[PDB]
Symmetry: C2
Subunit: 199 residues, 2 copies
């Protein structure tokens, strides 16, 4: 399959249609508030029928709340969840957790992302912005193949297809550019994850 | 005007009943993860029938996404929405936005919350931890009554009822403690918001 996680930022039925269409062709699907707002958490389980589901609600709550939230999501079928690294040291951990340490837009992460990255362990991997392949490459240098790296910020007006993967990422997260025409997934055909076969 | 926002961290039907019971007795209701997961976004409109709704999904996404999520929640009946200040300078703005700048648990905010507080303008208000009254008081020396302050972390395991209001908060946010026995709201009877009559 292609090293692409498709963000399903669209309506429930259309999201299911895309997941059905792309099952086995891509590495997974990203489910966010657009979908969860429509009918609730059940949508996670529907998409999870068709592939690995990363739930991305940018989780950033205190531990006893974050714990409950992650548990509900994984129980509904999520493979993993994206959480904010800024919570450190109150950071959800474990193999179901991806830790965001720099965003695609300017934030307080910018002054500290590499120190934060170096301090975090016992997680599935990290989210690094694919619109900054230099950041992805430096991250991979720091951590080697010890953890996954997944990267959004790929598509029009960010990193071109494969830019983050070439810089060291495992998977690129892409939304509208693929949703508007899923045939475009062929642009990732030449690429393979840097370190891990699955997200 | 009890200076209390009741967190409906519970199931949909129970949340409805509690809100009906407390209609006009409290300042508002906080709708979060648990309710949205169960009932989707429609729950916001249902609770709004009974009082002001603050939606707390700890929004922490890039500002185009965040601003659209805020607007969608407001359109469904929310008066305002809590977002993470860590995303500065890529933060949504305006009268529907409460900005969290320090949590009840240890996080990276703790080394910079006051600088962040002073950097953020043109929002509705700030969320500051009521289990740390000293932080609420220091925030007022910096911002005065220019913006609202609301505070969670109030309860048997946190700050005493009124502790945050006395330190300078406008409203305290309380969940389980009040849900267990709604008669407990009487503990807030002798308190009044420091700066703003409404959240
Ligand atoms: Cl991002
Ligand atoms: Ni995963
Ligand atoms: Ni409000």
């Amino acid at each position: 399959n292609l090293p692409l996680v498709v963000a399903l930022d669209t309506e429930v039925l259309k999201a299911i249609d895309v997941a059905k269409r792309l099952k086995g062709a891509v590495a997974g699907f990203k489910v966010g508030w657009d979908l969860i707002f429509e009918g609730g958490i059940s949508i996670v389980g529907e998409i999870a029928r068709y592939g690995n589901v990363i739930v991305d609600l940018k989780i950033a709550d205190v531990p006893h709340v974050a714990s409950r939230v992650v548990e509900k999501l994984v129980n509904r079928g999520a493979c993993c969840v994206i959480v904010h690294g800024f919570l450190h040291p109150s950071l959800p951990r474990g193999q179901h957790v991806y830790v965001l340490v720099k965003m695609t837009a300017p934030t307080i992460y910018d002054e500290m992302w590499e120190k934060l990255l170096n301090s975090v362990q016992d997680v599935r991997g990290f989210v690094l912005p694919g619109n900054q392949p230099e950041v992805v490459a430096q991250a991979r240098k720091r951590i080697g193949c010890s953890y996954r790296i997944i990267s959004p910020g790929i598509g029009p007006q960010g990193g071109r297809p494969g830019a983050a993967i070439e810089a060291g990422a495992d998977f690129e997260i892409v939304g509208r550019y693929v949703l508007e025409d899923p045939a475009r997934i062929s642009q990732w055909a030449q690429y393979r994850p840097t370190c891990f076969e699955t997200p």
